[PDB]
Amino acid sequence: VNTIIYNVGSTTISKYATFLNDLRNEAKDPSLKCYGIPMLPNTNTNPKYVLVELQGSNKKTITLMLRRNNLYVMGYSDPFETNKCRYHIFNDISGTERQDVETTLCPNANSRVSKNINFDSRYPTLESKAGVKSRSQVQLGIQILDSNIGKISGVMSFTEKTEAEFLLVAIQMVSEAARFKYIENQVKTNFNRAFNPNPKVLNLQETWGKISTAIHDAKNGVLPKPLELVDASGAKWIVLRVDEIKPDVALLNYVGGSCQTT
């Protein structure tokens, strides 16, 4: 499992763009692509995981564990006390995978401490805990990310609103940005300030699966059935060919079987 390092505490927009292209390269499958878009691997390709180490301000760090197959966050770790690695598995990781988030985020036994996340990773959950009606009311931004790392890393007690707010900002900034070129550019365009998620960033997050299947199943660039979407103002946005939506998407979720490659 490889780990990608990015310094949040001191960055430029290129430094954010390189990180992301190292995540995409590392996560994607080596041969599959539909219409020039990289596709994520089947569950069976090894390695199964990527680690994303986030360096905040004041020597604060969080290592984010992700699955290659669908780039979701399984949980995170932070340095705790002198020599402990504290791992935090999301409530909805089960089976071997739970031993796998432990073993991979904190590779040395003797030093491990558990502090689970007592809620699942779905956005409606994370919003109830932030105590907000919609992620859209919570601002995103590099300084917001840094400052949230600093509310979580090496702190004895931290509250669910604090934790959900960290994960809303970090899943959107790392896994949503990497799947969508559109969300990456929203973050580049506002790099020096805080900004509210617009309807399209939110809509793109929630329809990725359907987008991946449409694109895979498309013949001659024509999508199987029109794909109703929402744009940055809230307006119904209806795309029909792969060329419409492909600017906005960097990685495809796995769908098996063939598709037009290039």
From Swiss-Prot:
Q: Which GO terms describe its molecular function?
A: rRNA N-glycosylase activity; toxin activity
Task: Give me the gene this protein comes from.
Answer: PAP1
Give GO terms for biological process: defense response to virus; negative regulation of translation
The function of this protein is: Possesses antiviral potency. Inhibits viral infection of plants (tobacco mosaic virus). Inhibits protein synthesis. Releases both adenine and guanine from Escherichia coli rRNA in vitro. Activity on guanine is 20 times slower than that on adenine.
Q: What is its EC number?
A: 3.2.2.22
Catalytic residues as annotated in Swiss-Prot or TrEMBL: 72, 123, 176, 179
What catalytic activity is recorded? Endohydrolysis of the N-glycosidic bond at one specific adenosine on the 28S rRNA
Q: Which chain regions cross the lipid bilayer?
A: none
Protein's name in the database? Antiviral protein I
In which family does this protein belong, per the annotation?
A: Belongs to the ribosome-inactivating protein family. Type 1 RIP subfamily.
Native species of this protein? Phytolacca americana (American pokeweed)
Cite the binding residues for substrate: 73, 121, 175, 179
The organism's lineage is:
Eukaryota, Viridiplantae, Streptophyta, Embryophyta, Tracheophyta
What are the disulphide bonds in this sequence?
34-259, 85-106
| Keywords (A to Z) from UniProt | Antiviral defense, Disulfide bond, Hydrolase, Plant defense, Protein synthesis inhibitor, Signal, Toxin
User: In which tissues is this gene expressed?
Assistant: Expressed in spring leaves (at protein level). Expressed in roots (at protein level).
Q: How does it assemble?
A: Monomer.
Question: Is NADP tagged as a keyword?
Answer: no
Q: What else is known?
A: Depurinates genomic RNA of immunodeficiency virus type-I (HIV-I) and bacteriophage (MS 2) RNA. Inhibits the replication of HIV-1 in human peripheral blood mononuclear cells with IC(50) value of 14 nM.
